Design a protein around this ligand. Structure first.
Ligand code: COB
Ligand code: COB
Lengths: 483, 137, 483, 137
């Protein structure tokens, strides 16, 4: 197929579906007519899109963990624990990494081996191998809405199965589930395959079924400047809205400076709404998700709680609709159900300790929001230019030219030129701009903020500081000060 | 230190890349010729690079949890490729979840790995181990 | 002695000293001339007043636990763990409650029972029974400054011994170490006895020896309105300065609304400085201490970390010089060294995750600061009036007339008329004013905030809400919502 | 239920007062005549009040940790004062630190306490127990 930012016709979509469903025998379990009736019989309490509307309505932040294991019964026992002992508001199903490369063969051996070993040898739940039947078993066994959380360039079959499975949210996008996760997939192909995922949701909405989509904000989780992250989220939102998506949670990963982070999430929400309406999408319900620190964690569990709960405080004061929970096991391995419940209990406590509290406006916040909106518009403006008004084509060309550039992304289609680093108050800034199309004014502000760190630390800003910042939180602090 | 060659990468369906960049830089700064095959690398690419470059060691990083599956059989293949005796290191977060370390180390050594590293290992430790094992420390 | 807010003369003070030192045989270990030379040989790193100056200058918040056990060697092992494994910035020695009532007989019994049982049967360190000798062994075994933390109406001997012991800070005040801790002690006598404690520090400062004093901000730790709390601390700071104290840390206990708490800490600091200068004390170095939540804690340890670290975030953004650490054992019992170290590690991680970050000015903070300063001034103005310019006599009459009234204070000299409760955003307000001398405008603002909670909850504002607010954190949230 | 009289206070050198006020309020609400002697109360004040008022029970609160010392000997003294068989309850945070609860409960029963309560006990539990023990439930 040719890439263009235009809604797929029903005939085109259908021809693709018939191909996609043949990619594994469980595709035979997907019946769209049957799936709509199933989905419509799910209670509102278990519908992700509808619960998000409620959250928004009540001004509350809801908490959601990461979690998944190879075997169905075990996976279900884990989610129930998170729900009941943890108090989660939303449930995930974190998909294993073989699935994410469409290696269902490896998934199958992984399941057998996990069975034999009495423990999960997979780092998530193989949803495609378990089919619609298993995904439904999961949903029927819990009392909260369910969402696939993963990192899959070609997610078309997984999406068919988990939605027919009654999971009413799918995370990801054509940029965010490529560049941080793949080395050899073109931006064009992942945009096309995520158009399918958005268009399926579009189908379901057409039938009156509400299903959420969440672009993956944090990307590589490693010092991503808010303007670059937000440009990606806004783009994926627009490209989803074109295929008929009506309920969207845009996301952001904590950088650590409270004001910077609050600015980032407000800018994301505001400009997402602004762009949607400027391009004629006037019936999209937008929510926000704040992810707790996605970089390296300290191994000490008490220190980990320090990260978890400070991150939660930022989320709450930011007015985030959703916060993604980290655990005291983060530095070591996939958490036990008890360690995950811990993380969720600590998070929910903090949220309840801050009920209704929001950061008020200040000159400080105002200035950082102007900065982020200006940077972000530079990037989006250039994208629309390169695509001659088509944001899909503009996205491809933007990565080709380094206009869009994601720190540390393993994709060969990512330029890898832009370099981030923190300033003297821990705000993430641009150290090296590469081809990111900023004005000199915008470049001058980043330099000015960074010079302050240089002066305080008595050393020139450099890649060594970047290295220092990569290890800082794991070593006990936000900013990589020398020593 | 004297100039030796190593192969470095991240195995399987694992995309974690930051650790790989730090290890590359550190081992390079220590005086090694680092042949970095990157992320999402199957066993064969590790072996192909080792032969092409007559590598002294193969450093397998595995962070995403599925290393217990991905790492098995590597020694076997190296032997069959004529790389008998090559140094095999494995590190990162090589098993799923927090586990009893002595059990984990023996498991991977029983797989044929020369050295086996726990979560949060400083590059500096592996650098030191490698000069010692290569008799150049 | 007659009570007046005037510096005691040298002769005056000496004659009291010779009486006080006779109250237990360890008083014979105190030699003022010898102690000055001992104190002056302590390194700056171990002097509490000097490190506080350092913290101020560097704009950092320092962390300090509560800790104490009956036996000398065990107590030293404990403090060493907190320092080394915990990473404390300052060390306490929490004095046991028999000591606090001057029952050295019961302390004696408590030590023998603790020896026999292999565990502490005392809830703190009996510093008077351990003497100068014991107190110096503690100080020589650690590498951080040492402070007596307690709750003692007549602390005169204790002060002589711990200071001669090389402990370079003493917590307390004539109000704050009476009303929350005693039933039958007059305000006049505790004021008189704390004049001694302040005058001893004044002696030491006149010899070139720097020693910190810390009025106990949180009082009963149970819904204390910022303006009542701050009036006490400002008062104790003034009464200390009159006896020659030059290094003072005023304190405040977390109420839980971040903006309210930061307003309170800033108003406290600003008005303490202002009042000091208005009354001619021009060489007093003022710092601040923020205490993490002093009310009932949740028993779940993960939830407890949620309280500990949200509270730390507030302290850090407030610019507090010091923060007192709570532990995951708070709801249950005095923490083991491990649980204490856990609380310290979480706290310090949070602080380092927020290095140099401060809450910026907003209209909201502006308004709350204005309210708190005006409430506080109502109380202080009336106190000076009742005392015909003498704040010490004004303090006695104010407690007699209910002008100063501390919620839940066990003292029979406390009116117990004023009633606090949270508003709909969690700010502690005045429900029942008693004889607190507020203007109609000030009472009307309190009523207006509280009516919004009634409207939201659908119930009249009442003592039942107060009860609910008392239990809410231990049940999982800040505000006592119905159900 | 019935208008029984209890003595209520906090023992020894303990100044904790908030729980005492809640307990008074709840037991009063439940129908009891609460003789509240308050904080910092030695054993003798509990017994004096109990005699003066012909109390059916003495509820001893101990939060500050030194209750293991302070609570020893109350039964004996009640007996000597002619209060043989009176109900004796103790609750709060009665020992120093987190301990194994069954061991603690045994320890205070061995002192002569009829019922022994763990940290965080809701007043409603003690009210129900007391109505039972007094046959007014
Ligand atoms: C410098 C570098 C910084 N550290 C990092 O960069 C990793 C930090 C972090 C938070 C992990 C937790 C944590 N450490 O706190 C977590 N990821 Co990530 C959530 N992740 C991401 C980030 C990566 C972006 C990228 N492309 O690079 C993503 C958000 C995309 C992400 C995605 C995944 N992640 C996943 C998982 C499971 C994990 N992820 C981990 C690694 C961790 C430990 C988190 C957890 N706990 O649950 C998981 C592995 C668990 C386990 N082994 O049991 C998963 C499935 C999503 C999920 N369930 O959470 C998904 C899978 C993607 C995949 N296909 O592989 C990140 C950033 C992390 O250190 P490093 O540890 O990588 O390497 C370092 C290195 C350099 O200093 O020396 C050491 N070393 C490493 N290898 C070797 C040696 C040393 C020697 C001597 C050797 C021979 C080898 C040492 O280990
Ligand atoms: C409603 C009420 C709210 N709870 C409270 O009001 C107590 C909360 C809190 C934080 C304690 C921790 C926590 N719970 O999280 C802590 N205090 Co205070 C730091 N404290 C204070 C506060 C009191 C002000 C006042 N005058 O009332 C101060 C800051 C002054 C304070 C002072 C002290 N405190 C001290 C200590 C040690 C303790 N304090 C505790 C009680 C606790 C558990 C904290 C800790 N953990 O270390 C300590 C006791 C440890 C232990 N037993 O091992 C100490 C020495 C300072 C310090 N080292 O931390 C000092 C001593 C003063 C003294 N002379 O006694 C407070 C507020 C607390 O509940 P409650 O638990 O009192 O009673 C409640 C009640 C009503 O709902 O029913 C139950 N109940 C109680 N008794 C009985 C029953 C039920 C039945 C059926 C009975 C027969 C009896 C149940 O227990």
């Amino acid at each position: 197929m040719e890439l263009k930012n235009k809604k797929w016709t029903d005939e085109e979509f259908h021809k693709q579906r018939e191909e996609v469903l043949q990619q594994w025998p469980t595709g035979k379990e997907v019946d769209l007519q049957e799936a709509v009736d199933y989905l419509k019989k799910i209670p509102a309490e278990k519908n992700f899109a509808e619960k998000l509307v409620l959250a928004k309505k009540k001004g509350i932040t809801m908490a959601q963990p990461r979690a998944g294991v190879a075997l169905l019964d075990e996976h279900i026992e884990l989610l129930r624990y998170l729900q009941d002992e943890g108090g989660a508001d939303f449930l995930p199903s974190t998909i294993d990494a073989y699935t994410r490369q469409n290696r269902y063969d490896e998934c199958e051996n992984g399941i057998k081996e996990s069975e034999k070993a009495g423990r999960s040898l997979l780092n998530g739940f193989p949803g495609v191998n378990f089919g619609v039947k298993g995904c439904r078993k999961v949903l029927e066994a819990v009392n909260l809405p369910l969402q696939a959380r993963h990192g899959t360039p070609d997610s078309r079959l997984l999406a068919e199965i988990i939605h027919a499975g009654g999971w009413t949210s799918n995370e990801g996008g054509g940029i965010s589930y490529n560049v941080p996760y793949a080395k050899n997939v073109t931006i064009e192909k992942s945009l096309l395959d995520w158009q399918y995922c958005d268009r399926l949701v579009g189908f379901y909405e057409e039938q009156g079924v509400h299903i959420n989509r969440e672009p993956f904000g944090p990307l590589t989780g490693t010092l991503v400047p808010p303007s670059m992250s937000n440009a990606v989220g806004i783009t994926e939102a627009l490209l989803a809205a074109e295929q008929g998506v009506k309920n969207i949670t845009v996301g952001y990963g904590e950088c650590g400076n409270m004001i910077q982070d609050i600015a980032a999430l407000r800018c994301l929400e505001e400009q997402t709404n602004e762009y949607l309406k400027a391009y004629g999408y006037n019936d999209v319900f937008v929510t926000t998700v704040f992810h707790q620190w996605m970089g390296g964690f300290p191994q000490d569990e008490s220190k980990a709680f320090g990260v978890i709960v400070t991150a939660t405080t930022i989320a709450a004061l930011a007015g985030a609709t959703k916060v993604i929970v980290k655990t005291p096991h983060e530095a070591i391995g996939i958490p036990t159900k008890e360690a995950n419940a811990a993380g969720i209990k600590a998070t929910k406590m903090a949220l309840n300790m801050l009920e209704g509290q929001r950061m008020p406006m200040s000159k400080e916040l105002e200035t950082e929001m102007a900065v982020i909106k200006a940077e972000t518009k530079c990037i989006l403006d250039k994208m629309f230019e390169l695509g001659k008004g088509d944001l899909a084509i503009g996205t491809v060309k933007a990565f080709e030219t380094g206009v869009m550039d994601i720190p540390f992304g393993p994709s060969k289609y990512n330029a890898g030129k832009m370099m981030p680093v923190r300033d003297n108050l821990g705000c993430v800034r641009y150290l090296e701009f590469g081809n990111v199309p900023f004005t000199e004014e915008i470049k001058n502000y980043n330099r000015e903020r960074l010079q302050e760190r240089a002066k305080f630390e008595g050393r020139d800003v450099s890649f060594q500081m970047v290295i220092d910042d990569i290890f800082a939180v794991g070593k006990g602090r936000l900013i990589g000060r020398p020593e | 230190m004297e100039k030796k060659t190593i192969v470095l990468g991240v195995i399987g369906s694992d995309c974690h890349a930051v650790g790989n960049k730090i290890l590359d830089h550190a081992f390079t700064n220590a005086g090694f010729n680092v042949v970095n095959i990157g992320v999402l690398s199957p066993q064969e690419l590790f072996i192909k690079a080792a032969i092409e470059t007559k590598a002294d060691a193969i450093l397998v990083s595995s962070l995403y949890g599925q290393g217990e599956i991905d790492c098995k059989g590597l020694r076997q293949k190296c032997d069959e490729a004529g790389l008998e005796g090559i140094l095999l290191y494995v590190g990162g977060n090589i098993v799923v979840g927090k586990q009893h370390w002595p059990d984990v180390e023996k498991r991977f050594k029983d797989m044929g790995y020369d050295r086996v590293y726990a979560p949060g290992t400083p590059p500096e430790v592996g650098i030191a181990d490698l000069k010692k094992d290569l008799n150049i420390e």
